[PDB]
């Protein structure tokens, strides 16, 4: 069943939706880039556990 | 670790419920 | 074998699943496909209960139990002599309860009434499912679910309650016991009110809704009314089943100490009176 | 190395998917 919106209403809704989704998408991508440059999310083969790299006196929650 | 390990999935269940709430309400109405 | 007014409503349609093949009545019972599956699950589960009675040599409805597997079994399929029969009967009971509720949905569709009855039954079924699935998932095995024995599941209730020392003090138990007592209290009040209105002393005329309203207004200052009493009753019984869900899903999974200690953990330390 | 590439890709995606730039590809 149709929602009832005209083509123009759908177009303006889509303009707002593209703005919202793509603005959120770009801000989130910048945020994920910043968090990744701060600490990359994926560990690599060596891992990133402190117990595997830090000295024995560095406490690790793991 | 800590209590966030299950908090991820409690919030995930809440997110699924919240995303479905307008769907269920629109179906109800 | 059919009510004076029954044939007037015995029409085809209203089936969720079954079409016209299962859309008939055997005696008083409407069948439907969900009636067929409910009878299947019920009779097969009772035959598995009888199988456990045979293998355990326990031909007593009171002493016979289908217990879930051991805790070390986890979620694995158990031997039929080591909890597998309980697993089969758990599937059978879930299927029979769901089929019964869906047959009631079919009957409600056929009668044009709301689905409130299968919904309330589904709340009870939800308790059973969350107790026999949710508690195993929380605690890591089918062995944490209650067994299928008339008396032995009472022993399981006893032991699971005493696992937390004093189960009366459980918050969900306190709320749910209050809700069961309120449900019996309100059923007594409501049956008594309706019978009092329609059965006054001999020689008195049948009273009205105004009479029952002013009765509870004079009695306790508030009358919830004809619609309100049934809404409150459905709410009270449903809410006690949800309280049962919370109780069975929290004792152990979310508090392994005594419920007395649970109450001591927060209530005496509430800063408005902890000084 | 790899993290720098990931950050660069995410930044490029954010720039390209920004409404001002992504909308230029709108066609109706």
């Amino acid at each position: 069943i149709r929602t009832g919106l005209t083509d123009e209403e759908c177009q303006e809704i889509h303009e707002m939706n593209m703005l919202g989704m793509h603005a959120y998408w770009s801000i989130g991508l910048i945020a994920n880039a910043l968090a990744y440059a701060w600490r990359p999310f994926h560990q690599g083969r060596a891992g990133n556990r402190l117990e595997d790299h830090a000295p024995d006196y560095v406490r690790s929650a793991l | 670790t800590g209590e966030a390990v299950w908090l991820i999935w409690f919030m995930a269940a809440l997110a699924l419920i919240g995303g479905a709430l307008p769907i269920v309400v629109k179906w109800w109405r | 074998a059919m009510l004076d007014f029954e044939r007037k409503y015995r029409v085809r349609g209203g089936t969720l699943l079954g079409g016209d093949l299962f859309d008939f009545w055997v005696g008083p019972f409407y069948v439907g496909f969900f009636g067929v599956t409910a009878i299947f699950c019920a009779v097969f589960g009772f035959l598995m209960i009888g199988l456990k009675a045979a293998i355990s040599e326990t031909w007593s409805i009171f002493q016979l139990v289908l217990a879930p597997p051991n805790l070390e079994n986890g979620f694995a399929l158990a031997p039929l002599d080591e909890g597998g029969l309980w697993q089969i009967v758990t599937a059978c009971a879930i299927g029979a309860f769901v089929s019964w509720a869906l047959r009631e949905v079919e009957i409600s569709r056929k009668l044009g009434i709301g689905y409130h009855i299968p919904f309330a039954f589904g709340v009870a079924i939800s308790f059973f499912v969350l107790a026999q699935l949710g508690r195993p998932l929380l605690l890591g095995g089918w062995g944490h679910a209650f067994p299928y024995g008339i008396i032995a599941h009472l022993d399981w209730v006893n032991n699971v309650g005493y696992q937390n020392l004093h189960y009366h003090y459980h918050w969900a138990h306190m709320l749910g016991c209050s809700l069961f007592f309120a449900t019996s209290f309100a059923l007594a009040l409501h049956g008594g009110l309706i019978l009092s209105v329609t059965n006054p002393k001999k020689g008195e005329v049948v009273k009205t809704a105004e009479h029952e309203n002013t009765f509870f207004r004079d009695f306790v200052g508030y009358s919830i009314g004809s619609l309100g009493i049934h809404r409150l009753g459905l709410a009270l019984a449903l809410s006690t089943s949800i309280s049962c869900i919370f109780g069975i899903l929290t004792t152990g999974p979310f508090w392994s100490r005594g419920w007395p200690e649970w109450w001591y953990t927060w209530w005496p330390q509430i800063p408005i009176w902890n000084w | 190395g790899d993290a720098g590439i990931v950050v660069a890709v995410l930044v490029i995606l954010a720039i390209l998917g920004w409404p001002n730039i992504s909308s230029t590809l709108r066609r109706w």
């Binding site: 083969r45 402190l50 | 919030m11 | - | -």
Partner: protein
């Protein structure tokens, strides 16, 4: 996909997306908090601090 709103209710979709994204932002921040590496609230060191070379992500490193 401007024609989607001819068929799918935009208000329902947007409200659902916003509720889902609020609770999912909570979930993802909890995922970060659950991580020793990523919990900014507790501020643990990164293993890269004690590493003499870049761990990489797809880089085929060996012990």
């Amino acid at each position: 996909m401007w024609k989607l709103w001819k068929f799918v209710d935009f208000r329902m979709t947007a409200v659902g997306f916003h509720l889902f994204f609020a609770l999912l932002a909570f979930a993802v921040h909890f995922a970060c908090i659950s991580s020793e590496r990523f919990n900014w609230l507790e501020g643990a060191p990164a293993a890269e601090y004690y590493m003499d070379e870049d761990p990489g992500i797809w880089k085929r490193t060996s012990y």
